[PDB]
């Protein structure tokens, strides 16, 4: 029974930040983890299988997929959201073993969160240079197996586009909200 | 062991609420989420492959799926029903912080109920507008790669459409609960 | 540590029932959960794939599965399992908080196990009203898709009929004891 | 903290068993629930998948896989081991409310030990007289849709004869345990 | 809060064990459940599947998977783990009741492990006499049903290799450790 | 309620150990178990049934899968992932008994340490042998039942290439962590 330590962990963990950014970033947090892992997940498990190119060319199929989605949509957020956690998990480990030193801060948590602001940045970055914010329902697809310029359909168009316009509201919403602490830090110094 | 501090935690947060509300409406969200977990998952499993249509197209079938289904039914209502929790949490956290900081509240309870009222109101009538509040076994789609007007079956319209009403009428009652307590706290006030 | 306040939630909770009647019924619905959830669910999940008809017109098995069955046995079970459980958690949560405002029903026992009872009838009424109480391994279809009269099969009509009586067997089991419990009460009254 | 009462309860139960005799069927309890869930649910999930029979009638097929399987082997293992653990469940809640009366049994025993008993012999009877012991790779099916007398054959049939050898010999231990539990309290009495 | 009688108990079921002996063989067992689970078991999920014959005779190719794998090796190994885990288990609750017993053995254990051992050596010697130490990717199949002698081809024969050296590895190290144990007791005796 | 004997536990552990070296390790650790189980095991998922060869010959496809593929991806990370983490259990559980026997070290620590670094190195070289650090979409396949030269395709070799980097730069990474700890033993000694 020492649920009060955790409580004592938590708190120091949470002393530099701002009254409602660390409350609306961890209600935020478990909204992303919850929409990802419900409902962007079935969305995508027939992305490759309903997947077909009009051609009888043998192998076009799977090369143009793969051409059209170098990396799956859900795959890439899971990246997103696991950089974004890992600065936390890093500075939660970090703080807990200080305080364990203690019992026998601020310019490293500067440096987490301006690290994640920075991952948060360059997967929105990569996510808009790769495809864009937006998913078309036909696909023209040059490769080498296939012969001339082949044409090709996506799964399901624009519910992945609906996904796609609400996982880049949220990683906008978290973007701001790590800014704000940032700017909320500045003022305190 | 600290049982009696998640006791207080729960008082506080259902001080400012009527005394059937609060449990009404708990059980009911309780029932929601059993329903959707455990029934409706099963029966929108194969959606998109028992899906087909009367043509020799390539790449028919799946377009003129994805202009009858903008979103799957499931996970629309995975978003509403993640919505309509979010300013529950978000209050939870909230009133939690401000007990942590007595250690050492109506009107935001206020929004965050208004909040819930509008967010069920918006995806009702968005559920309403996209498609209404029935399946139709046979689906006439007209698309580009379809030549002329193709016609396309659905999975299970019957099924389907009983679901929709059990997910409608539990939205209603939802809707009814908390407008019967925002009119309590008028009557507080 | 207050393992002690859940018994005595528990004991106020069936201070007001038979002495095997709970029991009784606790054990049966333990079995009817670990029946519908280990058993029942594998042998309904390939309903439609297994499904198929002696006819040549596209979409014409998916219509025909859907006439012959409205809804899925395994998810009406699942209706009538949460509808049945919902006025028992509404009785626990409704007890649980007068303790609460004791520490700062009878009759609501009564409306419960009514509608409980209700329900068990309601649902048992309409599950004979639809198909009966057995599955047929012919099954003959009328359908505008397709033409004339068609002949389809299901998937493992013995099976399914066998895990039916089970099924309906069970359900005249918890009535008969619901009946019993309240008797009990009018000999108590 | 209430350990202590868990032991008193679990004492009380087994308190009119063989030193033995109570040890081994807990574990032999164990092991058949590891050896169901893990083992024989995989060899019997694509049963029907893999069914195949000797014959272009539409619907022919699965009429003789309804006919040549009354119910699946894993499904009705868990109905045997389901109606074994009833009466030790039912035991183990009565004593309970009868600890809890107490507060503020050899006979029933005794009946539920026969009708597990009883229940073991039952099941396995049924067992024996549907199919017998063992699986035939090659089956003839004469079933109204087929035309005269077609051939089919079973998924995997040496390794579902395996399975049945271990379920078989594993109910045979059982109920040998179970009758020197009841000799040993003859011995009592 | 009763941990340390969990303490107790272990302590009492290793007190005739080798300091490393049981340490080593708790980690190897550890790793072979991981091992199972995590790796093995999704690479012989399509085995029959991705099974084929180069025949077009109806029903051959499940009677030639068959005849090939009398029983799949995943399967084979949970039956080898379990039975080499069934004898822990016993002895385990055995002195657990024992304890009990003292509050209001050798011989035994070494019993345990002589037969866990034998379980062992029968096991492996199974495992090399069915179909020995490795799988080819060309099987030749002579059954009733394929007419002369047909060919047939294994899903992912040098994968499956591979694991089976890992397998085989894995109970002779346990095999080895349990013989050092033996070998320990009888310096002690 | 013993959480302070855990919390010493972890404390001797770690007692040789760099202040950051065990923080970015554990840190990694989890990573590395998230990233597999999450995002990798999905793309695997279908690497055999998407996998197909231009030819007609039967069960050429699959002897080509198995030559391209001597063992998935995911499987090979599990078992490095699971080779690394077994040194790290083993000292576990031996410090654990040590402080048993205290009740009633250094250089052991470094065994396994450099253990661990070796099976790094080791895994990371294998992986390099066998088919490098990138995958290509075409693939020439040469087997005894395809005739001549044959030509195949894989699933997905874009995204598969990618999650290949990543995996790779974990392993230089957490090689890089753990000839860290080493220099700084050395350092110490």
């Known amino acids: 029974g020492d649920w009060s330590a955790l409580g004592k962990l938590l708190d120091k963990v949470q002393a530099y930040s ?3 950014g660390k409350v609306w970033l961890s209600v935020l947090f478990i909204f992303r983890i919850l929409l990802l892992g419900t409902a ?3 969305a995508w498990g027939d992305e490759q299988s309903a997947f077909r190119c009009n051609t009888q060319q043998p192998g076009c199929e799977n090369v143009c997929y793969d051409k059209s989605f170098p990396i799956s949509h859900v795959r890439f ?3 997103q959201i696991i950089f ?3 600065p936390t998990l890093l500075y939660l480990a970090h703080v807990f073993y200080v305080m364990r030193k203690e019992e026998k801060l601020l310019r490293t948590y500067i440096i987490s969160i301006l690290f994640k602001s920075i991952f948060e940045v360059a997967f929105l970055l990569i ?3 790769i495809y864009g914010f937006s998913l078309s329902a036909v696909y023209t697809c040059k ?3 296939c ?3 082949v044409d090709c359909f996506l799964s399901r168009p ?3 586009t609906i996904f796609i316009i609400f996982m880049l509201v949220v990683s906008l919403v978290s973007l701001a909200l790590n800014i704000i602490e940032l700017f909320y830090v500045f003022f305190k110094g």
Chains 1, 2, 3, 4, 5, 6 share one sequence.
Do not use: C, F, I, M
Request: hydrophobic content about 35%; proline content about 8%; aromatic content about 12%.
């Open 18 to 20: 701002t009254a409602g």
């Open 40 to 42: 962007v997940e079935s």
């Open 77 to 79: 957020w899971v990246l």
């Open 84 to 86: 974004v956690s890992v």
């Open 127 to 129: 996510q808009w240079y």
């Open 143 to 145: 490769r080498d197996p």
């Open 147 to 149: 012969p001339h310029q």
């Open 158 to 160: 624009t519910e992945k």
